[PDB]
Design a protein around this nucleic acid. Structure first.
Lengths: 363, 175, 195, 49, 174, 171, 198, 52
RNA sequence: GCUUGUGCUGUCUUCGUCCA
């Protein structure tokens, strides 16, 4: 909100800010806000436009030096030029000295400006005398003033970042080099099938390759063309990645595609991991994967009755000797038990094995 | 940005004693958070005595700048860097500069400055409640664990202690 | 639990702040024999998705930030005609790039990058300051901000008569010229980036 | 386009006498112009007009 | 999904003010009207249920279903896990927690006495069942508090509200 | 508020299930499709009474598709909030915009504009809370609120409460 | 008219529209007629005379709009067609290394379900791009080794053993649509290794 | 410790699988890896796990 | 490295075909 108000105020006054002090003299900003923002906003200074050192514009308004240190910077510049008629209270001579130091009228051989004379100054004694007289800690401020005077508003940022192989791969594929590396298993779309090599394309268009020793199982002897076809998609395990050429090698062998399940380096330290609870939970999960579905069997036959063994015996009790009843067997849907009355309160159960069954309920 | 941070603060201008307590609290909090850095400073700069005192003075000066002078972190980092570092000359006359604080530590000091005012409000409310209790003789346990209290959890514990042991006075003022 | 949560949130906050600081702390690309921080003259190229139909669109931005001479190439980029057109375009007197930036949507961009780099190396296309001569640099450009720029209504209002891929090229060139301001132009959208 | 074949047409869009024709095959090829879509976003030789 | 026993309700032209749901005005809509019909079409009254009655009914039905599914062979978690459906399990768990943390009457005999007091009373013979459920559920302590929480009871000043509330508090286990 | 209602459901059965266990399979399908569901017209169905002895009748064969359609009538316990009703609640989450409470399966949201001003939200508190001089409401604290508005969704219900009136707030 | 007298409440009076002002009660579903918040619905919370405040349904936040821009509409029934750049159930690239599926769509926001299950609410502009994956890329392989295409119904065996029909495929993750999971309109994310084809 | 929801839904794909059966992890070392403890808390908020 | 495209008018008038 303050920025928009400042922009509107500048556009009211004339869309041009001559000097840093005009943020206070024109009532544009308050004291503390200006004190914060003075050295972080700058006004570009063109020496060809301002021929007057005593002019309204200021050299140091194009630097990072705060306005409270302008007289400090001008005293540094005046003392560096070996001037001796200078007095601290004479601001005009200070401005002339700094103007002739930063924009000399007759620069020496192969020197743009007299800023190189600043390196002869002993800033430590100046900071010591400042601390003694005025109780100001300004040792780093003298260095900042020196660096800004030698080159007004340098580029302090790091150099432009240039992408490496991993960054280029991540940029072009959106797969990091962590989620696409050796040992991982991915589905690949087969594109070419040959006698000795196979060419596939992954989901992110990275061209894969599989060799004869990695297509077929060791016990297999059939030709690769008979085993796979173009357009089919299969699972494969990564054996090498070329992050520069966007090419990878894969293997379709069972030893690589299926066994490698624990792809994460989970710290299974016994003191730091509950091994026994994990084993019990995994065993219970296998014991739940063993669950199966089952149902009764229905058979259409005049002497067939859906009864148990004891039920069949009781049913045959009311019937004379020689009558026959048929009941399902406990050994499975492929077996049938036939019970016939041998004698009063004596029955024989005979198991019959069925072969070439058309259906579980069929005969 | 300071107005946005301090918009939720009911009253920001602390008294002198409360301000000194705030400075001490921020120094203690930074000492707790920066324990490894202080250990590295003590071990690797053993030849210099009382560097932690210089660290305390620097943290207090940064808190002084932020609270009284209302300087934001970039201004302090750029134009007040001499208060955030210590220099000395070794036996071989070697000029050595030690960087006590960084920009992230200045932001953390801003965060602790913002955080302490909730503690101050809670402590003021607890002291006011104790005043309305109006004990004939000051409770040694209350003052003992109220002087050393530095987190709102301990203030909540003291509040629970007071509302339990002096429940009759609370009922009279008013389960 | 609350105390550890607050401490870990503080640590993660400072880590995210440092990561974002590493993201946005980039100067503009410095052309050779010029002082650091000087804005370079940029030429950006992209065919888009890399499909059969897609043509290459180019945008040239000078050091003053003004877009100049957007062009459309009407030939297969794997042919000699595209190479001749690009050689005539770069060697034109009114265009003097300091760097060539290339970015795209998939791995087909590698073919364009290799083609442009090989053409620049073979033809010896040097920087024209109009002495020591240096070849123009060809790089990959991170397009974090360009993909959001091309859909922004501000870009559409700025360039009403231009397609989306032209806005993508302008975003890439602006990112090369000033990464910080391009991050700032996202406004609320910069919190959705991968920091 | 239609589902029939176009390989029996000549350069001028007309079939020649003596050629075998089956149902739906194209015997006269004719096109009408259409104001192009936003395909000027870049389609080197494959933008429909 | 499920359809009520009340049907028809075709298009007309008149519009009425007794159509919006409102607890204060005792306008519960057509599907929750005072007069209902069973599967046989006979007359039926709206059946409100307090948290004690609801908790007893849900516990009884759930334990009956659990006993039936186990071949006829108390914990809320296992009883909730008896039901099928993860979202259903979460819903019944939330209801069990809500009922448990606000159970005014955890005993069958206390709930029976409360229901008999709130039904057989001469003053309560005019009280709406929703008012009865609200009084037995919210556990109010004062006539003014009950009137403020339940605006419908303000117009029924012929009810010995205070002594009924004191009897409810007495029956409530401290 | 809980109620007893006579509800009906239409159940369609594929011909592959035309076996002796048809009635029990229909019963379990009805239980899975009714228990825990939320219908805006009725509210929340929590349990079905006499769930193992529900009459299903005779199913009608749909012409042209073979599948049978069953009309199953049952009595179930149903809970539905009403506008202008005061009920108890338990706070589940605290936020600057307001607090979220749970009334059984229903989640009720109360905005700050329906909360008294003295219950200032304290985010520094552990856990964060809306606290006053004599009141402190946080996660898990008993609250008595009055339902003002109810929002009906396809298979969900959203309620809005208020605590600005008397005999409300912390309990 | 409504008044304490019953005989007055049974009378109908024809009144010009120029002397009528709408009455908005607290807790009523109202739909915005015109303005920046057009087609926003919700429940009225505060009635400050001319200005009315209401908690929205789409953004679920309080919105202050003048009473002249409100119509009492008990249901939203907002259609999101001809908006944004994203159809419902689109597989949208959130950023460089994030992807998701649009679950619900709004006038100026979207709800995205990530591959890991986290839900996000973003403006349309903040979405990086839309993934228009080719049909050959949109193929995965189940735990048995049988190919599963979009539209094939599959049912898990690990975990909760849920079932759904394939809606989108991203790497090893399958976005499934299901009837019984009403929590996210049927959309739940599982890896292809967890499912078996039916 | 795992709830039933956690007992089922904690699959290898999930980010919470890293700490599914963790134990004897000191509090002093939690601040070194804030993401781990934040993920634990977020899993707790889902009702899958309980931090004890 | 190279891959295959996915549809049709309306309204009248006249002349005819098989019965009636």
């Amino acid at each position: 909100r303050k920025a928009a108000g400042l922009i509107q105020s500048i556009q009211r006054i004339g869309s041009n800010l001559v000097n840093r002090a005009h943020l206070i003299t024109e009532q544009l900003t308050s004291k503390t806000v200006f004190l914060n923002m003075a050295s972080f906003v700058y006004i570009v200074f063109d020496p060809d436009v301002e021929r007057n050192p005593q002019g309204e514009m200021d050299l140091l308004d194009s630097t990072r030096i705060h306005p409270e240190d302008y007289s400090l910077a001008r005293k540094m510049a005046a003392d560096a030029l070996d001037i001796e008629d200078i007095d601290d209270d004479d601001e005009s001579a200070m401005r002339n000295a700094i103007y002739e130091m930063v924009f000399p009228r007759s620069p020496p051989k192969d020197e743009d400006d007299l800023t190189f004379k600043l390196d002869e100054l002993i800033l430590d004694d100046y900071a010591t005398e400042l601390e003694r007289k005025h109780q100001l800690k300004k040792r780093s401020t003298l260095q900042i003033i020196k660096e800004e005077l030698q080159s007004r508003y340098r580029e302090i940022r790091r150099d432009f970042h240039i992408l490496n192989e991993a960054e280029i791969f991540q940029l072009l594929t959106r797969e990091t080099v962590d989620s696409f590396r050796k040992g991982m298993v991915i589905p690949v779309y087969v594109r070419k099938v040959e006698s000795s090599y196979m060419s596939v394309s992954t989901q992110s268009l990275i061209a894969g390759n599989i060799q004869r020793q990695d297509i077929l199982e060791p016990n297999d002897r059939r030709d690769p063309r008979e085993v796979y076809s173009v357009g089919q998609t299969v699972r494969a395990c990564i054996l090498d990645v070329d992050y520069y050429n966007f090419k990878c090698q894969l293997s379709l062998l069972r030893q690589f595609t299926e066994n490698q399940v624990a792809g994460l380096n989970v710290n299974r330290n016994p003191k730091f991991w509950d091994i026994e609870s994990e084993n019990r939970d995994r065993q219970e999960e296998i014991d739940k994967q063993r669950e199966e579905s089952r149902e009764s069997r229905v058979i259409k036959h005049p002497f067939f009755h859906n009864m148990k063994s004891k039920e069949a015996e009781d049913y045959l009790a009311a019937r004379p000797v020689g009558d026959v009843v048929i009941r399902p067997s406990s050994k499975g849907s492929n077996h049938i038990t036939i019970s016939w009355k041998v004698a009063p309160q004596l029955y024989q159960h005979i198991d019959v094995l069925e072969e070439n069954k058309d259906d579980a309920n069929a005969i | 940005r300071f107005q946005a941070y301090r918009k939720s603060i009911k009253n920001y201008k602390l008294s002198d004693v409360d301000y000194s307590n705030e400075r001490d609290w921020i120094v203690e909090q930074l000492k707790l958070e920066k324990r490894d850095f202080l250990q590295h400073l003590t071990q690797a700069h053993s030849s210099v005595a009382h560097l932690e005192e210089k660290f305390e003075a620097s943290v207090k000066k940064i808190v002084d700048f932020i609270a009284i002078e209302s300087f934001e972190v970039p201004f302090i980092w750029n134009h007040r860097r001499d208060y955030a570092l210590h220099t000395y000359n070794d036996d071989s006359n070697n000029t050595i500069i030690v960087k006590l604080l960084n920009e992230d530590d200045l932001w953390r000091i801003v965060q602790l400055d913002l955080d302490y005012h909730s503690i101050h409000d809670k402590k003021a409310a607890l002291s006011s409640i104790y005043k309305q209790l109006d004990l004939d003789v000051v409770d040694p346990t209350y003052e003992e664990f109220f002087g050393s209290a530095r987190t709102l959890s301990e203030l909540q514990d003291i509040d629970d202690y007071l509302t339990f042991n002096y429940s009759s006075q609370v009922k009279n003022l008013t389960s | 639990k609350e105390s550890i949560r607050r401490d870990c949130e503080r640590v993660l906050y400072f880590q995210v702040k440092n990561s974002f600081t590493k993201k946005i702390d980039q100067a503009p690309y410095q052309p050779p024999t010029y002082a650091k921080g000087t804005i370079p003259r940029v030429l950006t190229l992209s065919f888009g998705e890399g499909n059969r139909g897609d043509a290459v669109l180019g945008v040239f931005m000078d050091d003053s930030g003004d877009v100049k001479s957007q062009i459309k190439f009407d030939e297969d980029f794997q042919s000699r005609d595209f190479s001749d057109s690009l050689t005539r375009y770069i060697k034109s007197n009114n265009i003097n790039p300091d760097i060539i930036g290339i970015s795209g949507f998939n791995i087909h961009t590698k073919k364009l990058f290799d083609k442009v780099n090989e053409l620049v190396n073979e033809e010896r296309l040097t920087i024209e300051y109009d002495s020591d001569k240096h070849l123009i640099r060809v790089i990959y450009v991170n397009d974090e901000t360009a993909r959001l720029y091309q859909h922004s209504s501000k870009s559409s209002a700025e360039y009403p008569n231009r397609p989306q891929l032209a806005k993508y090229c302008i975003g890439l060139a602006k990112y090369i010229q000033s990464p910080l301001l391009e991050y700032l132009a996202l406004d609320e959208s910069m919190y959705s980036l991968h920091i | 386009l239609k589902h029939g074949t176009y390989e029996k047409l000549d350069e001028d869009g007309l079939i020649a006498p003596g050629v075998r024709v089956s149902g739906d095959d194209i015997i006269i090829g004719k096109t009408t112009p259409i104001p192009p879509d936003t395909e000027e976003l870049g389609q080197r030789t494959k933008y429909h007009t | 999904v499920s359809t009520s026993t009340v049907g028809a309700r075709r298009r007309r032209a008149k519009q009425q003010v007794d159509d919006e749901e409102n607890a204060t005005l005792l306008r519960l809509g057509p599907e929750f009207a005072l007069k209902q019909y069973d599967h046989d079409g006979n007359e039926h009254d709206l059946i409100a249920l307090s948290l004690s009655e609801s908790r007893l009914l849900i516990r009884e039905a759930l334990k009956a279903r659990s006993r039936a599914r186990n071949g006829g062979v108390i914990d809320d978690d296992e009883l909730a896990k008896v039901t099928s459906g993860a979202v259903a399990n979460g819903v019944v768990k939330k209801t069990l927690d809500y009922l448990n943390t606000f159970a005014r009457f955890k005993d069958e005999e206390t709930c029976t006495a409360v229901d008999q007091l709130l039904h057989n009373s001469s003053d309560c013979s005019v009280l709406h069942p929703f008012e009865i459920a609200q009084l037995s559920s919210l556990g109010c302590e004062d006539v003014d508090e009950a009137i403020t929480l339940i605006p419908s009871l303000a117009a029924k000043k012929e009810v010995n509200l205070q002594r009924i509330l004191d009897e409810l508090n007495r029956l409530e286990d401290p | 508020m809980f109620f007893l209602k006579d509800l009906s459901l239409i159940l369609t059965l594929h011909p592959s299930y035309f076996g002796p266990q048809m009635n029990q399979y229909l019963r379990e399908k009805l239980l899975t499709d009714v228990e825990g569901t939320c219908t805006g017209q009725f509210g929340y169905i929590v349990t079905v009474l006499d769930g193992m002895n529900i009459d299903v009748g005779k199913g009608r064969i749909i012409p042209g598709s073979g599948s049978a359609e069953f009309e199953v009538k049952y009595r179930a316990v149903v809970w539905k909030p009403f506008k202008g009703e005061v009920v108890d609640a338990i706070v589940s989450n605290v936020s600057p915009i307001g607090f979220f409470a749970d009334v059984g399966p229903l989640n009720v949201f109360v905005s700050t504009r329906l909360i008294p001003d003295n219950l200032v939200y304290n985010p520094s508190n552990s856990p964060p809370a809306y606290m006053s001089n004599d009141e402190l409401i946080t996660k898990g604290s008993k609250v008595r609120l009055k339902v003002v508005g109810t929002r009906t969704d396809v298979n969900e219900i959203y309620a809005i409460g208020s605590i600005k009136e008397d005999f409300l707030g912390a309990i | 008219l409504h008044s304490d007298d019953d005989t007055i409440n049974s009378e109908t009076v024809e009144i010009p529209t120029s002397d009528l002002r709408k009455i908005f009660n607290v807790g009523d579903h109202v739909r915005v007629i015109h303005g920046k918040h057009t087609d926003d619905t919700g429940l009225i919370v505060e009635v400050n005379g001319d200005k009315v405040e209401f908690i929205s349904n789409q953004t679920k936040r309080t919105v202050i709009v003048f009473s002249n821009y409100l119509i009492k509409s008990t249901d939203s029934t907002v259609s999101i067609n001809e908006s944004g750049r994203f159809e419902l159930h689109d597989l949208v690239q959130v950023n460089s290394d994030l992807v998701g599926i649009v679950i619900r769509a709004q006038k100026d926001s979207f709800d995205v379900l990530c591959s890991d299950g986290k839900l996000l609410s973003l403006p349309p502009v903040s979405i990086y791009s839309k993934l228009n994956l080719n049909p050959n890329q949109q193929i995965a392989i189940d735990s048995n080794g049988v190919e599963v295409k979009v539209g094939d119904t599959v049912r898990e065996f690990t975990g909760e053993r849920r079932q759904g029909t394939i809606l989108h495929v991203y790497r090893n993750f399958l976005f499934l649509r299901s009837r019984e999971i009403v929590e996210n309109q049927g959309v739940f994310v599982t890896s292809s290794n967890r499912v078996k084809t039916i | 410790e795992l709830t039933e929801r956690g007992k089922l839904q904690i699959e290898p794909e999930s980010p919470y699988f890293d700490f599914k059966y963790a134990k004897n992890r000191p509090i002093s070392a939690l601040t070194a890896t804030p993401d781990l403890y934040l993920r634990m808390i977020q899993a707790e908020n889902d009702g899958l796990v309980n931090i004890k």
